[PDB]
Design an enzyme around this catalytic site. Sequence first.
Site, PDB file in Angstrom:
ATOM      1  CB  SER A  76      -4.572  -6.141   5.004  1.00  0.00           C
ATOM      2  OG  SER A  76      -4.168  -4.864   4.522  1.00  0.00           O
ATOM      3  NE  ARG A 133      -0.558 -11.231  -5.198  1.00  0.00           N
ATOM      4  CZ  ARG A 133      -1.604 -10.627  -4.439  1.00  0.00           C
ATOM      5  NH1 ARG A 133      -1.529  -9.494  -3.916  1.00  0.00           N
ATOM      6  NH2 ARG A 133      -2.475 -11.502  -4.590  1.00  0.00           N
ATOM      7  N   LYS A 182     -19.134  -3.821  10.634  1.00  0.00           N
ATOM      8  CA  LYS A 182     -17.946  -4.661  10.797  1.00  0.00           C
ATOM      9  C   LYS A 182     -16.543  -3.885  11.349  1.00  0.00           C
ATOM     10  CG  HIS A 219      -1.896  -0.915   1.109  1.00  0.00           C
ATOM     11  ND1 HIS A 219      -2.505  -1.737   2.346  1.00  0.00           N
ATOM     12  CD2 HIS A 219      -2.769  -1.623   0.478  1.00  0.00           C
ATOM     13  CE1 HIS A 219      -3.285  -2.476   2.113  1.00  0.00           C
ATOM     14  NE2 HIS A 219      -3.425  -2.424   0.801  1.00  0.00           N
TER      15      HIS A 219
END
Lengths: 156, 156, 157, 157, 157, 157
Positions: free
Chosen positions: E127, E90, E41, E17
Amino acid sequence: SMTGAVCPGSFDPVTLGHLDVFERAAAQFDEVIVAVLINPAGMFTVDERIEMIRESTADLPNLRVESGQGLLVDFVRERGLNAIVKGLRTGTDFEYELQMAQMNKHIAGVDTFFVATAPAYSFVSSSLAKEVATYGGDVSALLPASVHQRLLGKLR
Amino acid sequence: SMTGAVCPGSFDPVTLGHLDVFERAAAQFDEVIVAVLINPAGMFTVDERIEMIRESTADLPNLRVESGQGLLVDFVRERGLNAIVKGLRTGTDFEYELQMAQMNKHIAGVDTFFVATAPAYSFVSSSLAKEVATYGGDVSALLPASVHQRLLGKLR
Amino acid sequence: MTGAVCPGSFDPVTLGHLDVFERAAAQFDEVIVAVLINPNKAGMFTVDERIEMIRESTADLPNLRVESGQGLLVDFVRERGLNAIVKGLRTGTDFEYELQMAQMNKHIAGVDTFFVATAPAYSFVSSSLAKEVATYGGDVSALLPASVHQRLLGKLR
Amino acid sequence: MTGAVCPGSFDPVTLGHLDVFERAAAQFDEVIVAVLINPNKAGMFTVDERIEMIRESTADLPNLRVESGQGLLVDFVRERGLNAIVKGLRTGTDFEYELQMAQMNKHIAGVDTFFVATAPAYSFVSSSLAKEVATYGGDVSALLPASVHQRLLGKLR
Amino acid sequence: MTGAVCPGSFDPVTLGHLDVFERAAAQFDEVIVAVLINPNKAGMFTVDERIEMIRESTADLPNLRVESGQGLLVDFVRERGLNAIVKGLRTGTDFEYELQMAQMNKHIAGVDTFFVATAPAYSFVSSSLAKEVATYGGDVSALLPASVHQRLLGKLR
Amino acid sequence: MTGAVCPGSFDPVTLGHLDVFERAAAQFDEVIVAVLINPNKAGMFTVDERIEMIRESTADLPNLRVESGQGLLVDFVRERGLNAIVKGLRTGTDFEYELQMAQMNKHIAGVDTFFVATAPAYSFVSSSLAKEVATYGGDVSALLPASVHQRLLGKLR
Ligand SMILES: O=C(O)c1ccccc1C(=O)c1ccc(Cl)c([N+](=O)[O-])c1
Ligand SMILES: O=C(O)c1ccccc1C(=O)c1ccc(Cl)c([N+](=O)[O-])c1
Ligand SMILES: O=C(O)c1ccccc1C(=O)c1ccc(Cl)c([N+](=O)[O-])c1
Ligand SMILES: O=C(O)c1ccccc1C(=O)c1ccc(Cl)c([N+](=O)[O-])c1
C-alpha cells in the site's frame, strides 16, 4: 582475572528477556554494568528504569546499573572495560546489530558478544508489551513482578 | 574470578576469521579452549589441525587446543566450563546456530556467546578456501602463514 | 466441509508438530496428518510406528486422522477432496525453502498452504536435533511427546 | 566493448535464467552464457543438450552466445577478456550465499558480479525443484521454457 | 461454523491483499475483512472509502464481509466468536515481524494466525509503495485493483 | 553506448559508495551519479556540497558524471536515455527493501537494477552511522573518502 561487560539498552521497561541476558552475562563475566540509555521520549524516567532493574537483579552480586549518554564505546572505555553483551531474537536483529558491533570494534576496540534470547520470550519487546497493555491486554507473564505493577499505575 | 569459554569447530583448516574469534575470546575470558571436532572426512587430520592452531595462537597465553568428540555440552562441562564462543558472519548463520544454542542451554545449562566476524573475512570459510585453492586460485591472504604453506603441500 | 492436510516425516513427531495438529484441528472441519513414506531414505521409526505415536498423541482430536502417504503431496491432498496444507514455521529461514514449495504446490495443483508460527517454548526442537542429542546421551524428555520419548530411548539402545 | 558472463549449470535452464540473460543482453555489448559442467557428476542433461535448450530460448538475442566450461569461473571470464558476471537473485537468502562467491571472485581475480532481481512470476522455480516435481508427476508445463519441458519429460521416462 | 478474520489498514487494498481474501474465503466458512483504523492518524482514504474499495473487489466472494474496527485485533476477532487470523507473507522479513504479533496474540487471547504466501506476480506492491510511487507520477495502473487506481489518482490530485 | 545511473542521497558519500561508482564506471560506457534533492528532509551537506565531494573523489573516472535529481528516479533515468540503475548491497537485509523498489522500477518503467556486493572492509559503514559516530566524537577517518572527512568535521563544529 578481572573480566567484564556492559549490557546497554533503553529498558523502557526492562522485560524478562532483558533480565535473562543480564543473568547470563553476570554468570560469565566478573563484572557486569547495565547501561540505561538517556535519550533527549520514554514511558518511564531513567531513574524509574534503573530502579526497576535493580529490584529485579538484587540476587546478582556482580551487577550494577548506571545511566549513560553519548557514544556507547566511550561509556564502556571510561569504566575500564571493552566488551558489550546484547541479546538477539532473530537473524535480522543480528544484521542491524552486526553493523554497530563492527563499527564499535573499529573506532574503539570494544568487542560485542551476542546471546540468543530464551525461547519463551522470542516475541517480547518493551514496545509490544506497552502497546498491548495500553489497549487492555494481559502482559503480566512477560514482565518482571517489579515492572508489571508499575506499568499498571503508569497507564492508570 | 575464574571465567572461561570453549571455541568449537572443525577448523579444516583454521582461517584468519577463526583466529580472530580465538583472539577475541581470549581477550575476554580467563581461559579459552579450542575444541577441534573429530568426525568419523577432512583434508587435514585432527592432529594436523591442532598443530596449525597452536602455531597461530602461540601469542595467546590463556588458550589451549584439544580434540573433542560426542556432545559438545559434555566436552564443555567435563572441563568445568559452561560457555561456548562462536563467530557469525550473517543473519542466517545466526538462525542455524540459535537453534543449537537454545538446545545446548536447555539440555546442559551451557550458554553460547556469538561474535560478529571481522568484516575483512565476511566471505572466508574453510571450504571455499579449499575449493578455490584446489582449482588454482590464490587464497594466501585468507589463511594464516602456518596454514597456507601446509595447504599447498596437501594439494601438491 | 472444510479441511487441511498436515504433511511431514514425523520421525519422530515433536511437541511442535503436535501444536500444529491441534491448531489445525481447531480451525478446520477435518484434518489429515500425512506421514511420508520415503522409500529411499529410511529413518529411525517405521511409518507404522510413526503413525501409532501420532495417534496416541492426538487421541482427543476426533476430527483428525493419520495416514501414510507417498509421492507428490498435492496428489495426496487432491485425492482426499482437499486443497489446503497446514505446516509450522519456526523462523524466517523455515519460511524460505518452504515458500518455494508452497508456491509450486499452488501453481501445479491449486493447493493452498497455510503456515502457523510455532509456540515459542519448542521453537528450537526438530526431529533431527532431538535424535542427534538423544543418541549422544542428552536429555530430551521435556522436548518430546510422552508417546515418543521412551520409544526413542528404546530404538537407541 | 562491454561484456558480461552469465554462469550456471543450467540443468535445465529455467524461465528465471532466461529473464537474467535478456536483461544482461540489454545492458552489455556482449553476453556469454557459461554452462559450467562438473566433470564428476553427470546432471540430467548432457552439455550438448543444455546448450541446445538455451540456444533455442535465446534465438532473439543476437549479442548472446553459449559456451561450456569447467573449473574456476573467474578463469573462464578472464580468458574472454571480460571481468563481469551477471546472476539473478530471489531472496536475501540467495544474496547471502552468492555474496560469498562474489567477494571471493573479486578478491582472487578482480572480477565483478552484478546481481539482478529476477521477474517475480516464475522466480520460485529452480532447476532442482522443477526436476523433483516432474519426477513425481507434477504438472510443470506452465512453469518451464518450451525448449525444456518435453525434453525433461523425455528424460524422466 | 469455521471462520477467519483478515486484518489490515487497507489504505488502499492491494492485489496482494485481495489474493489473501480469496484464499481465506476458499478455506473457511466465513471471512471477515477487518479494516483497522487509527483514530489518531488519518490515512489517505476514509473508512467508508476503504470499505467501498474492498467490497467492489470482493463482490464474487459471498461468504466474505467487510467491517471496520480499532484497538486490539484479538478483541475484534473474539467478539465475532472466532479465533483465527489470516494474513499474507512475502519474505522471511515479513514473517519475522508478524511472528511476534502472532505469538503475542496467541499468548493474550488464544487467537491463532495462519499465514499464506502471496501470489508472486504482485507481491512486491505494498500500500505504501504504491501511494509513494503514484505521488510522484509513476505509472501504477497495472499494479493495483481497478476499484483503487483512479480513486487513488483522484486523492493525489 | 551502454549506461547506468547510480542514485543516492550521498550525505556524505562513503568509501562504499565510491566502490560502487568505480565498478559501474568499469563496466558501462557512461555512468551518471544522481544526487537526490529531498525538499522535505534536508541533511548535513547541501546538494552542491555533496556533488563537489563526489566529483573530487571521481576525478579519474572520465565516463562518470555527477548530477542532482528530484522526484521519481525512473523518470530521471529515462530522461537521460538510460534504463539501468546500479546500487550497492551490504547484506541480505539491504536486498529486502531494495528488492521491492527494484521490482517496482522494472514494472512501472522497464528500468533494470543491478546490485553489486560491497567490498568487505567497508560493509558496516553507512552515511548515517558515520555521521552519528562523528557527531559524538568517534574517529571515522579510515571509513570516509579524503574529500569528505575534513569537511565533515567542519560541519559538526
Ligand atoms: O553508541 C552510539 O552509537 C550512540 C551514540 C549516540 C547516542 C547513543 C548511542 C548508543 O548507541 C547508546 C545506546 C545505549 C546506551 Cl546505554 C548508550 N550510552 O549510555 O552510552 C549509548
Ligand atoms: O554437540 C553436538 O550436537 C554434537 C553431537 C555429536 C557430535 C558432534 C556434536 C557437535 O556439535 C560438536 C561440534 C564440535 C566439537 Cl569440537 C564437538 N566436540 O568435540 O565435542 C562436538
Ligand atoms: O510433494 C513433493 O514434492 C514430494 C514428492 C515426492 C515425495 C515426497 C514429496 C513431498 O513433499 C511429500 C512430503 C511429505 C509427505 Cl507426507 C508427502 N506425501 O505423503 O505424499 C509428500
Ligand atoms: O523513485 C522514487 O521512488 C522517488 C520518488 C520521489 C523522490 C525520490 C525517489 C527516489 O527513490 C530517488 C532516490 C534517489 C534519487 Cl537520486 C532520485 N532522483 O535523483 O530522482 C530519486
